[PDB]
Symmetry: C2
Subunit: 127 residues, 2 copies
């Protein structure tokens, strides 16, 4: 659980350093290693469209394994700027590298929901 | 993670002790605390019917939160002897006590799938 980003109780991360101001630029969002182990082998991923406005705490897509369908819950309100199409196309990549090449989208934030540090999130997950 | 029972890579348990002969009695199945953490607050459970024959590794029911639907994958082949109507009627009970009052059903096993010890299952999930 990289201490270089922030996390949600719903097992996502957003690349705002904990304590930091929300950047004057697009920040990537993804799922945690704990979500990967929860889900199993990923088979389908549905992302918001580039240019859509999402809201913190609202369901804005899904990740899906052979056994589980799980809603993506936006860590931040804002406009979607990029989607990681390599991730959608080869969802096995998300499981390989959830904090790196497996990022799911980037958002330009106007607001953030409840965010946890890596320590707080690790603690919620018995780590 | 109670050391007294067996676990699957899909985040269930079954009350067969490590190295125990597959028993003459019915044994309980349920989900692990890792499963609960991942799912969130549970709002709906679908279990197999009493009298139904299930197959190890086959999807035999479902647990559901507001954000996730997740298939129950049978740890064991066998006949469903009993279901926890209490947990189906009050699924919050499952999050509160996944290894005790939150058990889901009991099965009379004729076979078992891949099972893991408490420690092996802990090691896969970094606990």
């Amino acid at each position: 659980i990289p201490g270089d980003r922030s996390y949600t109780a719903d097992h996502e991360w957003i690349d705002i350093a904990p304590g930091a101001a929300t950047p004057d630029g697009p920040v990537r969002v993804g799922i945690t290693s704990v979500a990967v182990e929860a889900l199993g082998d990923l088979v389908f991923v549905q992302l918001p469209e580039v240019g859509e406005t999402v809201s913190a705490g609202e369901s804005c897509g899904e990740v899906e394994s052979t056994k589980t369908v799980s809603d993506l819950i936006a860590p931040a309100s804002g406009q979607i700027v990029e989607v990681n199409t390599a991730a959608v196309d080869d969802p096995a990549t998300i499981a390989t590298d959830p904090y790196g090449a497996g990022w799911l989208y980037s958002v330009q934030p106007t607001a953030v929901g409840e965010l946890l540090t890596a320590s707080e999130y690790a603690g919620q997950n018995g780590l």
